[PDB]
Amino acid sequence: ADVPAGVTLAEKQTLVRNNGSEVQSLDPHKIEGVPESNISRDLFEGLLVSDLDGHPAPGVAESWDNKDAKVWTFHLRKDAKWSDGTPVTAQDFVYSWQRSVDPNTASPYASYLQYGHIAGIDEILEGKKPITDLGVKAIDDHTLEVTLSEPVPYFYKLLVHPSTSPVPKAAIEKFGEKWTQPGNIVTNGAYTLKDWVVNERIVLERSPTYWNNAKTVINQVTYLPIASEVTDVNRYRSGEIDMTNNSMPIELFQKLKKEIPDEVHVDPYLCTYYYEINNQKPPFNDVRVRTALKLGMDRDIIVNKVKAQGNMPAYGYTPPYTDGAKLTQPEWFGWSQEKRNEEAKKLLAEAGYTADKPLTINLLYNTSDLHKKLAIAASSLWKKNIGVNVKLVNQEWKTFLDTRHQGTFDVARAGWCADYNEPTSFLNTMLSNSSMNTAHYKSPAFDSIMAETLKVTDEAQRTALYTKAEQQLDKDSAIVPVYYYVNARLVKPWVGGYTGKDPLDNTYTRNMYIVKH
C-alpha cells in the first residue's frame, strides 16, 4: 500500500469483504471466476501484478526484457519467499506453468498461456506432447526464460493472471487435493490462509515472509460468501461488511446512489454488450443492412431507461479504457438518434426495404431476465426507429453457443469480456480464422491491420493500428455495439487504496488501508 501524505491510519487494520459466493478452490490451477480470483491474488503472486491503474508492475520479477518479442527473460527478485520461508525460484515457475497446461490438471484456465504462444503449448494442451516440452526454462534460480513460437509484444501483460501464479510442488505432492487446507498450504502472496469455514468465512492473515510486507497495511482480511445481494448491502449498512461484492439489482442501486453516492463505486470493466450480426447470411452480408441495424439501436434508451446502472453507450468493440487503446468516436455516434434513424432508413431503402416491404430479422438470445428484457427493448426500438420487424428466439447456453458457431442465426445477443488488459483480447476474436469469430466476419484489411500490430516495435504505432482495426470493424458494421460494462460496489469511506481505475478489477488487499474514523 502507498498511504498518502497526511492520512491517519486506524489502530485496527482489518477488512471484511463480501465475495459473493462460496469459493470451491484456493488452488490457482483449479480456480475459475472472480470470487476465486480475488482470494488467489492475496495468497499467490506471479511474475507481475496489476498496479492501482491496472497497468503491469513488478511482482516476483523485479525486471524483464525480450528479444524480438519472442524470447522473454524475467529477472526474479532474490528475496521472494514462500510462507515456510523458502525461496521462490525460477524452477517454481517452470513446474507451475507445466502443471497449468497439463490436461491431467484439467485447469479451467489451461489454455490461458496460449494467448502467449509459448513454444510447444498447442500440442501439450491436446495431450499429444509432454508438459516438459513447454518453452519455459530456469536459466538459474532467479532467471526465467520463456520462448514463444511467434512474436507477442504484450506477453508480459498476461502474467498478472492468477492462473500464471506459482504453486508449491512439495505441498501438492505431499497432500494432493488437501494441499490448500489451512494446515498444509504454502503461499507467496501478501497474505496466508488462517481459517476456512465452509459457508461462513475465509480469513487471511498478513504474511511476514512476503518480500514487500513492509508496505502491507491490512493485517487481516475476511471474505464472506453471501449470494443474496440485498443481504450483502444490509450487512454493509449495519457495519459488519466494509466492501460488498460487485453486484446489485438496479432499484437498490438507484436508492443507494441517492443516500450514499460516494460509497457506491461504479467502475468501468472490460466487457462489451453487443448484438452479433451473422455477416455470412443474406441479407446480413449487405453492409447497408448491418449499418442500418447499428444506427437504429438507441444506446441512450438502453442505458438510461432500460438499465440505469451507469453502463456507458458503446460505439465500438474494444472498450476505450482498455490499456493500449486510444479510440476515435465515429461521426455517427455524435449525431442525434433521429438523424441516425433517417440515415438508417435511407440505407435500408437502397437495399430494397421500404415501408411497404420491410426487413424482418430474428434475434437470438440465451434464456435470461436481463437478456430477454434487453431483447424486447431492442426489438421495440428497431421496429419504431427504422421500420425493422424482429422475432425473438431463445435457446439454452450449450445450444445458443453451438447455433452461433454453426451460423444458424440472423443476429445474436452477445457479450465479450477481456481475459487481459490489452486491445488484442477483443480484436483477435474478429480475425477471419479465429475459432471465436461467431460474427463470421472475414475482412482481409482487418486481418492485415492486426498482423502488422505484431511487427511494429513502437507502442504509439501499435496503438494507432488498433484504432485503425476498430475503424475497419465499424466501417464494415460487423456488429451492433450497445454498451461497455461497469461493476458497482459499496466501499466504506474509511477504506483507502481502492481507486476503481483497473478495468479488470484486479485488486489486492496489500494495496488497501483503514483510515481512522
Curated annotation (Swiss-Prot):
Places the protein is found: Periplasm
InterPro entries reported for this sequence: Peptide/Ni-bd, SBP_5, SBP_5_CS, SBP_5_dom
Major place of residence: periplasm
Any one annotated GO CC term: ATP-binding cassette (ABC) transporter complex, substrate-binding subunit-containing
Record keywords: Disulfide bond, Peptide transport, Periplasm, Protein transport, Signal, Transport
Gene3D superfamilies: Dipeptide-binding Protein, Domain 1, Dipeptide-binding Protein, Domain 3, Periplasmic binding protein-like II
Family stated for the protein in its record: Belongs to the bacterial solute-binding protein 5 family.
Subunit structure: The complex is composed of two ATP-binding proteins (OppD and OppF), two transmembrane proteins (OppB and OppC) and a solute-binding protein (OppA).
Function, in words: Part of the ABC transporter complex OppABCDF involved in the uptake of oligopeptides. Plays an important nutritional role. Binds peptides containing from two to five amino acid residues. Displays a preference for tripeptides and tetrapeptides over dipeptides and pentapeptides, for peptides composed of L-amino acids and for positively charged peptides. Cannot bind the cell wall peptide L-Ala-D-Gly-gamma-meso-diaminopimelic acid.
Name this protein carries in UniProt: Periplasmic oligopeptide-binding protein OppA
